[PDB]
Design a protein around this ligand. Structure first.
Ligand SMILES: CC(C)(CCCCCCN=C=S)c1cc(O)c2c(c1)OC(C)(C)[C@@H]1CC[C@@H](CO)C[C@@H]21
Ligand SMILES: Cc1cc2nc3c(=O)[nH]c(=O)nc-3n(C[C@H](O)[C@H](O)[C@H](O)COP(=O)(O)O)c2cc1C
Ligand SMILES: CC(C)CCC[C@@H](C)[C@H]1CC[C@H]2[C@@H]3CC=C4C[C@@H](O)CC[C@]4(C)[C@H]3CC[C@]12C
Length: 431
């Protein structure tokens, strides 16, 4: 038993600001989605290839949600309308389902693009047109079912219950359940997109592994000269002396692997004593379908010029490691052959990032969702655990406007970014 006017914290100036922000964004949001829906149906008449299952659901939810929200919000605040419990829970159920289905659409958009990254080869087997058709339908029914529950029962007046100080006639247990399901998909949305950016961050920069024997220090100076062209180009480098290497999984996670070794053949071809242990235990090395290249120092005076490079390349192509370019072979000092070093290093780089606008969009969406749903659900958690003062009700009233802004910026985030929709919008014009 709570007074309806107790939920109405309304300063005539605060009432005008509420009305201004809600009638601008409201009329602006409705016109946006009413245009988006018109474009899809116009596009449906011309092209049957774009699914438009996600953008249509998001637009319908934002249109229906905003229309009922702005009207009820202004009627409740500016006009101070006192409705019966069922008539209010009918209206509150309507907006809640629409906004729930809206964020449920973003949840289905998250799983659509999460499966494409986690399981690219199996994406076409899971996400289909009938499955997405059924999923959205069930997403809408569940969204309606949950939001109709307060009207059916499970409210603060039907049961001896502890009520909400921001939503009249609502049981806090129902809100905690509603917050839970909304928070789970939101956290999954945040987790998925954060999982996309961290996964794409490792692929942007390539990793190059350099090992060398070099008793005298020439193949090291070579590798040190080899590494800088790679490093200056933008390659993560992990040069390692062959005397301090671990055999098993030595090449794991390297897009390119450069194996340099000096030849030390007094009588017969012999490699660097430090490079021999790694040579023997190569099978242990990943040694498979790994882009790899060789280099090494030698001298013309010997019958086997850089025979080490030949022995290594024979084991690499034996196990199937793709040798992208021939091994680099140097005699004497590589300080005079610096040009050929950076030449072979730029060539092995030639023979072989991410969409930042799509990467920033995820950042933007995450920043948007954290901005629009963070404080909104936060105030509701304050209502569930303990209670709040009058200022928080006023802040929540302004924060109730914050989710409406999300419905305004969504057709700019997704529909405007749709290359197919913009084609359908231009097709509206003569030719
Ligand atoms: C959509 C959103 C942000 C959250 C609802 C879902 C939460 C779980 C409920 N299960 C929301 C926030 C609101 O502040 C209000 C809303 C809807 O609906 C109307 C406009 C009918 C209310 C009128 C009476 C006001 C008194 O506080 C509150 C007004
Ligand atoms: C005992 C001995 C054997 C060598 N055998 C070879 C050989 O078979 N083939 C070759 O090209 N150079 C051979 N060299 C020359 C070295 O490979 C050359 O000095 C090289 O620049 C050494 O590289 P590092 O400074 O990276 O150890 C040999 C040198 C010595 C002292
Ligand atoms: C929210 C309450 C008050 C009324 C909802 C009833 C109507 C408007 C709801 C219930 C079922 C919903 C449909 C369920 C399935 C989809 C597929 C989706 O890809 C586009 C939206 C669309 C076509 C929904 C449009 C809106 C819809 C028809």
């Amino acid at each position: 038993f709570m007074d309806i006017e107790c939920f109405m914290v309304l300063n005539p100036s605060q009432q005008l600001a509420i009305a201004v922000l809600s009638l601008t964004l409201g009329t602006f949001t409705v016109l946006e989605n009413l245009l988006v829906l018109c474009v899809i149906l116009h596009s449906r008449s011309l092209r049957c290839r774009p699914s438009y299952h996600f953008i249509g659901s998001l637009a319908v939810a934002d249109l229906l949600g905003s229309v009922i929200f702005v009207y009820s919000f202004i009627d409740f605040h500016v006009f101070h309308r006192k409705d019966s419990r069922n008539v209010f829970l009918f209206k509150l159920g309507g907006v809640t389902a629409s906004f729930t289905a809206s964020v449920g659409s973003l949840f289905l958009a998250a799983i659509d693009r999460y499966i494409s990254i986690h399981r690219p080869l199996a994406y076409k087997r899971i996400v289909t047109r009938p499955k997405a058709v059924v999923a959205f339908c069930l997403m809408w029914t569940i969204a309606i079912v949950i939001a109709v529950l307060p009207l059916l029962g499970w409210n603060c007046e039907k049961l001896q219950s502890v009520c909400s100080d921001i939503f009249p006639h609502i049981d806090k247990t129902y809100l905690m359940f509603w917050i839970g399901v909304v928070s789970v998909l939101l956290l999954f949305i945040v987790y998925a997109y954060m999982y996309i950016l961290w996964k794409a961050h490792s692929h942007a920069v390539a990793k190059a592994l350099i090992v060398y024997g070099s008793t005298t220090g020439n193949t090291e100076y070579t590798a040190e000269t080899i590494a800088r062209e790679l490093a200056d180009a933008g390659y993560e480098v992990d040069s390692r002396d062959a005397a301090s290497v671990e055999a098993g999984g030595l090449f794991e996670g390297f897009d390119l692997v450069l194996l340099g070794c000096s030849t030390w053949g007094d009588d017969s071809i012999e490699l660097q004593d430090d490079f021999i242990p790694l040579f023997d235990s190569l099978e242990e090395t990943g040694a498979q379908g790994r882009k790899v290249a060789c280099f090494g120092c030698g001298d013309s005076s010997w019958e086997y010029f850089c025979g080490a490079v030949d022995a290594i390349e024979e084991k690499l192509k034996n196990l199937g490691a793709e040798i992208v370019q021939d091994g680099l072979r140097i005699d004497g000092d590589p300080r005079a052959a610096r040009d050929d070093i950076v030449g072979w290093a730029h060539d092995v780089r030639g023979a072989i990032r991410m969409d930042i606008e799509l990467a920033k969009t995820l950042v933007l969406i995450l920043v948007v969702l954290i901005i629009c749903w963070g404080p909104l659900l936060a105030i509701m958690v304050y209502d569930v655990f303990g209670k709040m003062n009058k200022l928080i009700k006023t802040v929540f009233a302004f924060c109730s406007m914050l989710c409406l802004l999300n419905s305004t910026v969504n057709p700019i985030i997704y529909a405007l970014r749709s290359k197919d929709l913009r084609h359908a919008f231009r097709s509206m014009f003569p030719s």
